[PDB]
Design a protein around this ligand. Structure first.
Ligand SMILES: NC(=O)c1ccc[n+]([C@@H]2O[C@H](COP(=O)([O-])OP(=O)(O)OC[C@H]3O[C@@H](n4cnc5c(N)ncnc54)[C@H](O)[C@@H]3O)[C@@H](O)[C@H]2O)c1
Ligand SMILES: NC(=O)c1ccc[n+]([C@@H]2O[C@H](COP(=O)([O-])OP(=O)(O)OC[C@H]3O[C@@H](n4cnc5c(N)ncnc54)[C@H](O)[C@@H]3O)[C@@H](O)[C@H]2O)c1
Lengths: 475, 475
């Protein structure tokens, strides 16, 4: 039957019961030993309350805010004598403040994004740099430096960011094998970075194609997606952002860097969900993706950075998202950006409203001796329905990663603040793999210069096909 | 008891029996009186043959080519007893050559596009300038200068190009009436140009939104559209092209002009169907359109040019297409450009496969004292089904414009080569209006700087919202 990995001894407080909370609850119930009365869900929504009541789970209908979070969460995180687990799956809440609260009260923590308090983004005097995921991430790195060790808190452990960090490692191992590079698999960050450098990985796309299709035609003035509409829109309006590789020789005139921090990233002064890049996945083959900002674009490039004695980077891969969302979401973006406003209404596709499709989510490592290698999941909606309730394929990749992260945290409860790149990738993938459908690695001869130049002249660098100059779509 | 407009005392030869041919034939049968055996349809397609045969239509299965066109068409067009009519609704045939042949033999002619012989649109030595609609239109204008007068031949009389030229004239009249710039209705080209100048019309979008939705999901690797896929892809891969107004103070670095010809146009060194512009229609409100090249963009701007004594343009409007095609075609374009190749298959939406929706097609005159005014048709699929068989709402707007052009040519059969702009707009709209559903004029306060600048800096011109600099999408 289903494996039970650990006993949870304290309260489980799930913040948020949207598409991911709903998918994660049944996995938590399935894979951990605890009395159900120990778990409670907090979410302000009436729809969420109704679903919770049908599922027989404790529910508190409240919005967690900067003004109430200490008063509200401390009693819940500290109920009884066991160590609790805060599972944060919300929007509009500060990941940093909640995480720090959990740690100071001895509870484990996990989330899937570095989220700021409601109001952060539409503040009048917020500079574009301050709206970046690089800056949000630096607040978490800062917290780690300020309080080393202590109770484990896992930042950004969803599908992406999260799982894709584990795929990068598995892909590096596979590439090393296929290129005839033999030796000890790496066990430290410095060794992972050197492996990437040695293999000649110039960069990495988080290369995703969602083919889930709805049982109804897209309504006008409704934003449709397979996961958070609020979350997608929020990240889509942040600056286009990327981990910036040492091999790059060109950047747009509207690119900018950062004065402080780890140094791994740049951003563009334009929204990521309206920025296209040339990418590839096995089912899609050549496609456009959107350059949406994501924590892993920075965290993976930072993680795989090799520095010299002086502390300067000698190697770092480029890393960014190349997202082709579901058809209705592509239409929803076209509608949003063309109108200049958010749609009147929105909805997230339920599994019962999906006629077919997969969430093809993987990592595309390029520039090495086999040109490009894609490693990841081809999870279908049909498989998802069989193996995990109350979610679509997009949801299951995320919720199963949260599960893997929780397993790791309970097995390593005094690791301090950690990112998915800090977790044991094999253990995490061992826990996750049952929920990923086919996981495959395939090589391709495709490059961003495929079929170029064509009818019209373009600004391309023919000496090096993988340069960002060739990837970025100039509109 | 639909009205009959004219007797036709000679052969009617329809070249092409695709989406438009299938919608046009029943209107011809409805509105003209002729020996029914005098009509014949020529198309190489097996699908076209089976359709025609199941309806008792006289059919020749052949491709009209550079090699066979004289031998094939002369006998059909001159079969008598009186003057024939060549109705060209094909792809991959030369409009110019067929039109000149019909004229040499005294047959009336009509088409909906200036099309070249097969093979034109890919050459080792075809410069982008020579692929432009401006250049193709210059061959028609040259033909007219070469042989003035004679038998009427109507160039580019579909919905757009075609009907929209009549809409521009009606809109100019309406604007004037609303603003009391009233007087004699213009009767000459120069008077129309001066009315546009006196109203302060800085430019015109052919502003279209197709909301027809398919009853089936978007198939992978199939291009879907509501009219010719071959035709749409062809124009979509031509350079983005526009009539270029005297008020414009900026153009892209990749813009180019022409050494000769009417002087009314420029082109961009990029594909039109991958070029976005900010536009507006009544149902969509603010939307993106694609800057797809079209004959009317040049013909309307040329028609409304005012010249001083020396002969240089002192006034001309900007004019271009701002096309939001149906949801499935938007996705088809994203797929084609992202993949860098044409899909393996294609499908035109039949009326029976459309859930609901309209083809909202009009002209948006901007820059004048009332900011912006949209005039056009909001024909629904439901109304289309009640009034005309075998077509969707896109098709009916085109087929009814061909009907109107045919009526005009029969009424004025010695007018020489003529464009839509040369026809009597009131008579054509009288004929066409029963097939257009609601035809409305709407003012708006929208401009291309609505909501700008916003979260990010952009190169905009705040002194004049309507500058192309502000319309063109440059992320
Ligand atoms: N790493 C990844 O792979 C990944 C993937 C998907 C989603 N996400 C992120 O995970 C989070 C959840 O995604 P989702 O699809 O479930 O979103 P969702 O929009 O479906 O649900 C969000 C929930 O948060 C609740 N909420 C809003 N404000 C709150 C508050 N102040 N306190 C408590 N709850 C509040 C809402 O009522 C809602 O039920 C989002 O932040 C999203 O960006 C990450
Ligand atoms: N002005 C406008 O508003 C407008 C609107 C729609 C279409 N169009 C144009 O009208 C034309 C027809 O459109 P459609 O939607 O019917 O296209 P379609 O692609 O449905 O049909 C084209 C037909 O032409 C036939 N054909 C191909 N090669 C031929 C040849 N060598 N000789 C004879 N026939 C040949 C094909 O077999 C096909 O049946 C196209 O050129 C299109 O671009 C103009």
């Amino acid at each position: 039957d289903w494996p039970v990995y650990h006993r949870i001894d304290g309260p489980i407080v799930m913040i948020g019961f949207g598409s991911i909370g709903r998918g994660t609850l049944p996995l938590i119930e399935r894979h951990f030993a605890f009395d159900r009365s120990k778990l409670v869900v907090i979410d302000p929504s009436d729809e969420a309350r109704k679903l919770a009541e049908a599922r027989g789970v404790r529910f508190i209908q409240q919005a967690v805010t900067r003004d109430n979070y200490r008063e509200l969460l401390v009693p819940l995180l500290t109920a009884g004598p066991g160590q609790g687990f805060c599972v944060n799956l919300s929007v509009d809440t500060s990941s940093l403040d909640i995480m720090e609260l959990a740690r100071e009260n001895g509870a484990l923590y996990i989330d899937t994004v570095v989220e700021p308090w409601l109001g952060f983004y539409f503040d009048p005097d917020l500079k574009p740099e301050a709206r970046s995921n690089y800056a949000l991430r630096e607040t978490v790195l800062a917290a780690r430096r300020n309080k080393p060790g202590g109770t484990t808190a896992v930042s950004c452990c969803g599908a992406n960011p999260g799982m894709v960090s584990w795929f990068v490692k598995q892909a590096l191992v596979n590439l090393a094998a296929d290129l005839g590079v033999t030796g000890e698999e790496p066990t430290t960050r410095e060794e992972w970075a050197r492996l990437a450098m040695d293999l000649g990985v110039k960069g990495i796309h988080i290369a995703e194609r969602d083919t889930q299709r709805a049982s109804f035609p897209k309504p006008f003035d409704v934003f449709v997606n397979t996961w958070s509409v609020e979350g997608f829109v929020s990240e889509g309006l942040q600056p286009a952002e990327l981990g910036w590789g040492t091999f790059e020789r060109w950047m747009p005139d509207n690119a900018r860097g950062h004065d402080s921090g780890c140094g791994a990233g740049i951003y563009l002064l334009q929204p990521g969900a309206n920025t296209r890049v040339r990418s590839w996945t096995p089912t899609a083959m050549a496609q456009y993706g959107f350059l949406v900002t994501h924590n892993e674009s920075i965290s993976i490039a930072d993680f795989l950075t090799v520095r010299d004695a002086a502390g300067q980077a000698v190697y770092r891969p480029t890393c960014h998202y190349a997202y082709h969302p579901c058809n209705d979401a592509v239409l929803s973006l076209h509608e949003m950006f063309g109108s200049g406003k958010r749609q009147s209404d929105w909805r997230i596709l339920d599994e019962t409203e999906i006629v077919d499709g997969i969430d093809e989510l993987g990592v595309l490592l390029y520039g090495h001796g086999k040109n490009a290698y894609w490693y990841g999941s081809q999870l279908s909606i049909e498989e998802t329905r069989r193996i995990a309730p109350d979610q679509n394929a997009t949801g299951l990749q995320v919720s199963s990663a949260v599960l893997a992260g929780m397993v790791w945290a309970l097995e390593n409860p005094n690791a301090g603040i950690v990112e998915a790149d800090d977790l044991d990738f094999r253990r995490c993938l061992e826990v996750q793999t049952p929920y990923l459908g086919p996981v495959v690695g395939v090589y391709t001869d495709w490059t961003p210069l495929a079929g170029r130049p064509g009818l019209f002249p373009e600004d391309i660098d023919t000496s090096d096909p993988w340069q960002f100059r060739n990837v970025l779509v100039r509109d």
